[PDB]
Amino acid sequence: IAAAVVGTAAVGTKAATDPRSVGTQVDDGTLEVRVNSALSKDEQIKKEARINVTAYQGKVLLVGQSPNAELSARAKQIAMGVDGANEVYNEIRQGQPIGLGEASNDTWITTKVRSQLLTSDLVKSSNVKVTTENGEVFLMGLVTEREAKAAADIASRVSGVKRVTTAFTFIKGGLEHH
């Protein structure tokens, strides 16, 4: 039965999809929150694994404990994906080193730089990341010029290091508000 009295010029609402909701959107807290939420979202990731988030200046550093690389790696990628994250550095104390020689040297070198850096009351062990791998020393985190110079100082006067990378970023060292 052709029961079509009306069917002319109906309202066909067409929906759209935003290509880019935002362009460059960086936030220490927002990034920290989104990855935290995602980490706690994945049950198995928060079941046997636990990764900790530290975000600063637009880049994120993650450190934690996991019984599987699958959990920690999947956590990272799922957590941030694409969203303001400028650089992502993840250290999990899971798996094995690249060699025995590097492993022995890592803790030894890290230990002496620790001792000398620790003398500075302004620099806290949980404020700066020190890690030695393969023979190269990596230092990271936001600190003022005092802690920054302390880290670089010790890394330079301690001989033996074949290569050292230092992402010393300065936390409001003075910074006039005018």
Side-chain angles (χ1 to χ4, degrees), residues 57-113:
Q57 97 112 9
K59 50 89 57 123
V60 190
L61 155 84
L62 311 155
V63 288
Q65 213 52 49
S66 307
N68 210 319
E70 109 133 273
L71 287 180
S72 12
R74 167 226 288 230
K76 175 192 88 170
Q77 54 165 126
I78 258 90
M80 31 250 307
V82 47
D83 197 68
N86 245 282
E87 352 164 310
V88 189
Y89 300 87
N90 192 22
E91 199 198 286
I92 321 286
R93 275 85 117 90
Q94 111 267 267
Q96 51 149 104
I98 217 268
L100 319 170
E102 69 123 350
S104 304
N105 259 276
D106 141 79
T107 324
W108 162 240
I109 271 134
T110 297
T111 283
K112 34 227 259 88
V113 302

Side-chain angles (χ1 to χ4, degrees), residues 138-162:
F138 263 77
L139 275 123
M140 234 202 305
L142 238 189
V143 288
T144 82
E145 351 87 72
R146 318 288 115 218
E147 310 88 274
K149 88 103 218 165
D153 215 328
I154 301 320
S156 307
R157 48 214 306 149
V158 168
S159 313
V161 190
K162 50 121 123 189

